[PDB]
Write an enzyme that holds these catalytic residues in place. Structure first.
Site: not given
Ligand SMILES: [Zn+2]
Lengths: 317, 120, 53
Positions: A74-76, A78
């Site tokens: 997961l992206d930072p 998110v």
RNA sequence: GAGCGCGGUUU
RNA sequence: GGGCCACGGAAACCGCGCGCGGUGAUCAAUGAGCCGCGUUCGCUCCCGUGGCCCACAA
């Protein structure tokens, strides 16, 4: 609201006479807390901020763990479901990676579009899409609320789909453009937003409750048995007399199957279970469900990743 | 109401609290925001900690009550964090606020500490 | 942050009341965490009392 | 080493 | 010979991002700008080293 991981499977019975010996192995809820962890998976609710890698690094240092890996990154910015495999369970992330995800996103339009246009245009992205190059599947899109330029919606997708890219393309289709302002993953394979979904505070606090107060309850609930990570795979269940052989690298021959799911096609990724529903190994099918069922000899599954320790079950060969 | 809220505060009591932070701003000395507020308590500079009842997530301020007791610092609950921000002289909310030097609300604050004494 | 969630129904919404159940909504994202966890000692103190430990 | 999952220079 | 398991198949700097500490703001106090220090897990093929087995399930 349906992903392929949700399909229900039929259990076909191969040996009706097969029983399990309760003196062998450890079913998930018969495991001392320390063994639970060694073979545990955290359904973490990642917070916005840190990368998925950093999050896992904190967990290792704070729980004093040797090894741990997450599933889908997961992206930072998110949040939501980030499965974290611990210790000897770490390699099961490989079972999780291909499975589908679900998100709740907040899209921001760069111009004004009627609520009916929006809903209708998003409807059209269901099915295959292609993003910058490769093709990816959108299982469903549901628009929950529109408040002018803000569109809140749920989406179910194949592993790999970039939600940013998708929202951008929706912006182009509407013409005015759009960006994603907020994202939260609500489901990743067998992991969902349920009472098992635990935040970091709750996770580290529960750890101290156990490590510094003798209270075992809260932290045990924080950790799922690695079996959880495999709820979505087709399974074949094996007789006790085959279990030790298989943890020893033996392939699974047809005479050791007690029960299996229907639908298995050669090449498929299958979970090998014991009759107590402990996870023995991951494997690739060499036979279809029907072939395994009608035969009396042959290799039915090539055993590729072994998780269960060699000494849980006796060497019955 | 939230679990980090450990007692009930009458309209009048919580109204005085906003006047205290009000007056302390332009004639005394205050700190605003949970980070400055928590530094103030741990440095033993804070006379009265004011905590808003509508904070979400709780964890933002849930540490403040136990902290204040450790340090023997009085704290009170005001109903809204929007108006607690306005009182500290900002157009934005404030989850928490410490009054560092009472200023003209000097007696007003002695009283508030009294009423909370009982409420415990 | 604007995404909110009904604790009762599990509904995701931008509103402060569940449009489905009527319950008050809470912010969907979890609070930020620090590896240093400066106030863990005190948050835990609060939390023990909440869980009747 | 070769891939799948943070950008730029150094032996 | 084959299978499974373990370990290895690089290191130091910069930027971004984020975290903490400090300061604490003309709609980010649930933390702006600036300063200092920190900081990015693992998986799959193959190769080497070593360990356990060779088990159609009785
Ligand atoms: Zn409802």
């Amino acid at each position: 609201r349906i992903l392929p991981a949700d399909i229900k499977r039929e259990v076909l019975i191969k040996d009706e006479n097969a029983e399990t010996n309760p003196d062998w192995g450890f079913p998930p809820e018969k495991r001392p807390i320390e063994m639970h962890i060694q073979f545990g998976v955290i359904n973490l609710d990642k917070p916005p901020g840190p990368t998925s890698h950093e999050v896992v690094a904190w967990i290792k240092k704070i729980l004093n763990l040797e090894k741990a890996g997450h599933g889908g990154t997961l992206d930072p910015k998110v949040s939501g479901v980030l499965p974290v495999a611990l210790e000897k369970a770490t390699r099961v992330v490989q079972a999780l990676l291909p499975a589908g995800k679900e998100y709740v996103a907040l899209m921001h339009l760069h111009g004004d579009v009627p609520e009916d246009k929006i809903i209708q245009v998003m409807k059209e992205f269901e099915g295959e899409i292609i993003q910058r190059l490769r093709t990816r599947k959108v299982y469903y899109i549901e628009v929950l609320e529109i408040e002018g330029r803000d569109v809140l919606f749920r989406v179910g997708v194949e592993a790999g789909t970039y939600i940013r890219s998708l929202i951008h393309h929706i912006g182009l289709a509407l013409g005015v453009g759009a960006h994603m302002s907020e994202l939260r993953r609500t489901r990743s394979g067998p992991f969902k937003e349920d009472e098992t979904l635990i935040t970091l505070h709750d996770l580290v606090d529960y750890y101290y409750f156990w490590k510094e107060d003798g209270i075992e309850e809260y932290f045990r609930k924080a950790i799922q048995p690695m079996e959880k990570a495999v709820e979505h795979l087709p399974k074949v269940w094996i007789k006790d007399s085959a279990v030790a052989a298989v943890t020893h690298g033996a392939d699974l021959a047809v005479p050791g199957i007690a029960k299996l799911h229907a639908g298995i096609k050669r090449g498929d990724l299958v979970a090998i279970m014991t009759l107590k529903d402990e996870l023995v190994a991951l494997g690739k099918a060499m036979m279809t469900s029907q072939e395994m069922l009608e035969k009396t000899k042959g290799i039915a599954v090539d055993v590729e990743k072994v998780f269960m320790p060699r000494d849980w079950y006796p060497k019955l060969w | 109401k939230p679990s980090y809220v450990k007692f009930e505060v009458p309209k009048e009591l919580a109204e005085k609290a906003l006047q205290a932070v009000e007056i302390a701003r332009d004639t005394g000395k205050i700190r605003k925001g949970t980070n400055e507020t928590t530094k103030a308590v741990e440095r033993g500079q804070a006379k009265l900690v004011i905590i808003a009842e509508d904070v979400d997530p709780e964890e933002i301020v849930a540490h403040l009550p136990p902290l204040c007791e450790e340090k023997e610092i009085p704290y009170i609950y005001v109903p809204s964090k929007k108006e607690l921000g306005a009182a500290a002289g900002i157009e934005v909310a404030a989850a928490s606020v410490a009054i560092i030097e009472p200023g003209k609300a000097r007696d007003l604050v002695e009283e508030i500490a009294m009423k909370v004494k009982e409420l415990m | 942050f604007r995404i909110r969630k009904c604790p009762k129904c599990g509904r995701y919404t931008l509103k402060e009341v569940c449009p489905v159940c009527g319950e008050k909504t809470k912010v969907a994202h979890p609070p930020r965490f620090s590896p240093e966890d400066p106030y863990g000692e005190y948050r835990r103190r609060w939390k023990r009392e909440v869980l009747g430990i």
